């Protein structure tokens, strides 16, 4: 049957770290995840953005782990993270995306593109201001732009980056 | 079943 | 009473 | 008035729970670890458009509202599925094994879910997370029903009725001799209908009550038509009854086959759909 | 370990487990007499099935037959424990032919110190109750007296299987039922890491870790009060005990027939 | 898993990178078609080079 | 009986 | 009190 | 407690 005290822990302490995810419980998250180690780690990603004591780190390992072999569960969240987190350096996130991409060919693709679109609009800003300068910044935010244009097509979003070129 | 209440009136007594 | 017994345990 | 059947849906299985979409066009059985699909519309359509496989019996299943999703509860874990050009769109997995019953509340966000335990589970749709749970019931609930003013919850579970605040505590109970297997609440208001071998109409808050016996075994499922002027009682002795609201004067009665275990009514009065234990669904025009 | 030599290791391991009495009852501040008594003990017994001419070895709850004894131990030298008090305890090198051990035999012999199991091995080889019985009752001493009067009166007019410990418990109840900091994720990482590398288990800190949970919000009027409370009190008593209602409601309904038929 | 250049040169050992080739298999003038990405074997990239993480 | 006379203890039970 | 008495022993 | 120290007492 049941294990003696073994199983029956380990389920009592399921059930604890349900109710911690239910009610906050940044200290019995703390102390029942640690009990609990002891796939899945959803919670374990959950607590640390809900309680912090820099969130990002776990979740990169567990993107790391079962890798050799719709599309993979841990990892589609993990890109959308960073994004949101941004909001270092990021070029170094989208060569990053790029190789994922290239590992694996919902889709990534529009993930990547969408990131690019975040550096485009602080470019659109910056190259507004006079503190005056024609060609530099405009000529790499138009390159930008198109590059973000190839990603998609391969309207809502498109009438956005015009209306941030312009402003450029 | 068992062994987990039993665990539990531990824990309660430790508690007390 | 009760209450305190427990006490007394612990 | 009376009902006229219109059409059968072969389950091929005992269909524990139906549901009509809303016009609505297809109708939900559920059956064992499948619900299927049939579109109505279409009078030859022998066999389900599809199918969706959650689990094991299927104990309820119902739409939200608009009719975007489905919730299906059978085992531990509740599917929500997306009918939207359905799929798989969430899980939520809870610690009691089986639930018996499913409500939604008025503003979409929140499903209620009746343990086998006997605990009312609450979940946010949006987190697909447990914000609260009431427990009262020893065993497990069996059915239940939102007050009309939405304020309030009701619960039928083994011999006993208990009435929730939408806040929290529980309001009243009931007790009964026997179980009770299902619950309506009046649409208009003040009144109760509950499912045991006899149905028993509770005024609310009043103490008097009526009590109907047109019910040979027990009475499996309950609704009440959206208009509140009448409802209708499965039963296990094959029958299917309907009456006027309050104090249950038989409308009219069909026999069916086999033990009706569900039912549904479309949300303007016009069909009835009934699953049964010959493991098929009948589908029923009302006539005026 | 091999056939016979299987035989040999599973009973080395069953010897090591002996030191867990050895590690326990230090620990305690028992006698140490204690070590005297359970060396005879293991002694006279396995020596004996052994005895039996190199036919069959012998199986156990391996961890229940050394409780036993240790409960045994108790009984002649008479310390105050009970059979639930002993399972309490259980909540909180090795050799290599341990190692290379028969899987069944491996298994038996086992780690850690169905509620008939337990009360039917000890079996088949009244001032001590009174603290824990009198406290769970909450009596400042009359219910204890008139207990001891009882049961001592049950034995002489001998309305009396079970054991004389369920006896007493059970005619217990019969009286009192009518009375006239945090490593992190980095830990996980490290493991995951090591794992891809060769890698080669229960600790208290489990213990301390849910009694902290648990301290932190984590875990006819008359007489039918009285009959309440009674129940109340079976319930509870199998479960601290670590024993059933099956085998507890059933004693103590002979007991009281017996007692019935003596007094007529 | 990444690898740098200067682990080859000390272990004698080819810089080889990964190649990625994927089919298109098509039937009956191309009714059904079925893609599928398949290692292409190892290759030997130049160092500080775009495939190369320096 | 040693337990069982322990159980004095009658005298300190009445007293309390 | 009884268990105070006890304490107190 | 208690009963540990009845032990050592006897």
């Not at chain 3, 009473?1 to 612990?10: R, T, V």
């Not at chain 5, 240790?70 to 310390?79: G, I, K």
Request: proline share 3%; with cysteine.
């Amino acid at each position: 049957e049941v294990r003696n005290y073994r199983t029956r822990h380990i389920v009592t302490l399921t059930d604890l770290l349900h109710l911690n995810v239910s009610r906050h419980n940044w200290s019995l998250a703390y102390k029942i995840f640690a009990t609990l180690i002891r796939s899945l780690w959803g919670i374990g990603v959950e607590i640390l953005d809900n309680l912090s004591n820099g969130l990002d780190f776990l979740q990169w390992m567990c993107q790391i782990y079962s890798s050799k072999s719709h599309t993979a569960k841990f990892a589609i969240t993990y890109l959308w993270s960073s994004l949101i987190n941004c909001q270092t350096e990021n070029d170094l996130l989208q060569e990053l995306i790029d190789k994922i991409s290239e590992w694996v060919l919902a889709e990534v693709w529009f993930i990547y593109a969408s990131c690019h679109l975040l550096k485009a609009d602080t470019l659109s800003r910056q190259f507004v201001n006079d503190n005056d300068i024609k060609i530099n910044q405009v000529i790499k935010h138009i390159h930008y732009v198109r590059t973000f244009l190839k990603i998609c097509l391969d309207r809502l979003i498109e009438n956005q980056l015009k209306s941030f070129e312009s402003r450029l | 079943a068992a062994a987990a209440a039993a665990a539990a009136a531990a824990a309660a007594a430790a508690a007390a | 009473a009760a209450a305190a017994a427990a006490a007394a345990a612990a | 008035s009376d009902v006229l059947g219109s059409q059968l849906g072969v389950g091929v299985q005992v269909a524990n729970r139906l549901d009509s979409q809303y016009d609505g066009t297809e109708i939900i059985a559920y059956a064992s670890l499948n619900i299927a699909v049939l579109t109505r519309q279409n009078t030859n359509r022998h066999n389900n458009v599809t199918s969706i496989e959650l689990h094991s019996p299927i104990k309820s299943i119902k739409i939200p509202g608009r009719s975007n999703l489905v919730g299906i509860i059978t085992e531990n874990s509740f599917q929500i599925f997306r009918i939207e050009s359905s799929e798989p769109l969430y899980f939520v997995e809870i610690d009691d094994l089986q639930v018996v019953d499913f409500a939604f509340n008025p503003d979409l966000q929140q499903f209620a879910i009746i343990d086998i335990k006997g605990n009312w589970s609450i979940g946010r749709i949006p987190i697909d997370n447990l914000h609260g749970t009431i427990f009262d019931p020893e065993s497990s609930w069996k059915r239940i029903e939102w007050f009309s003013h939405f304020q309030k919850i009701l619960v039928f579970d083994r011999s006993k009725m208990i009435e929730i605040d939408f806040m929290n505590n529980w309001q009243t109970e009931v007790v009964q001799a026997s179980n009770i297997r299902d619950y309506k609440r009046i649409d208009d208001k003040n009144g109760i209908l509950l499912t045991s071998r006899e149905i028993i109409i509770v005024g609310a808050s009043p103490v008097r009550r009526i009590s109907w016996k047109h019910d040979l075994d027990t009475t499996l499922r309950i609704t009440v038509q959206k208009v509140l002027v009448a409802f209708v009682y499965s039963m296990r002795h094959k029958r299917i009854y309907m009456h006027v609201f309050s104090h249950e004067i038989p409308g009219g009665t069909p026999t069916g086959i086999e033990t009706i275990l569900t039912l549904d009514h479309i949300d303007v009065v016009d069909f009835l759909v009934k699953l049964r234990n010959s493991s098929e669904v009948y589908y029923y025009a009302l006539s005026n | 370990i091999g056939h016979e030599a299987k035989l040999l290791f599973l009973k080395s391991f069953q010897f090591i487990l002996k030191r867990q009495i050895r590690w326990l009852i230090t620990e305690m501040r028992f006698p140490k007499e204690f070590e005297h008594v359970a060396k005879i003990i293991w002694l006279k017994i396995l020596k004996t099935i052994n005895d039996q001419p190199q036919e069959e070895l012998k199986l156990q709850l391996h961890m229940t037959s050394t409780i036993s004894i240790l409960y045994l131990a108790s009984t002649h030298l008479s310390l105050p424990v009970y059979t639930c008090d002993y399972i309490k305890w259980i909540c909180t090198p090795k050799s290599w032919r341990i190692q290379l051990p028969n899987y069944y035999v491996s298994i038996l012999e086992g780690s850690i110190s169905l509620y008939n199991k337990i009360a039917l091995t000890c079996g088949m080889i009244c001032q001590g109750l009174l603290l824990k019985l009198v406290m769970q009752c909450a009596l400042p001493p009359e219910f204890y007296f008139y207990t001891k009067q009882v049961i001592e009166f049950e034995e002489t007019d001998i309305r009396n299987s079970n054991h004389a410990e369920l006896r007493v418990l059970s005619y217990f109840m019969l009286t009192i039922n009518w009375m006239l900091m945090t490593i992190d994720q980095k830990i996980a990482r490290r493991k995951l890491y090591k794992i891809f590398p060769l890698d080669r288990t229960h600790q208290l800190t489990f213990i301390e870790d849910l009694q902290e949970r648990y301290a932190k919000q984590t875990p006819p009027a008359r007489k039918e009060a009285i009959g309440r409370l009674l129940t109340h009190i079976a319930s509870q008593l199998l479960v601290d005990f670590a024993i059933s209602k099956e085998q507890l409601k059933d004693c103590i309904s002979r007991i009281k027939n017996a007692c019935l038929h003596r007094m007529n | 898993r990444k690898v740098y250049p200067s682990e080859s040169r000390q272990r004698l050992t080819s810089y080889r990178g990964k190649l990625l080739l994927k089919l298109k298999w098509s039937v009956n003038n191309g009714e059904e078609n079925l893609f599928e990405v398949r290692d292409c074997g190892g290759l030997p990239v130049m160092l500080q080079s775009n495939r190369c993480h320096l």
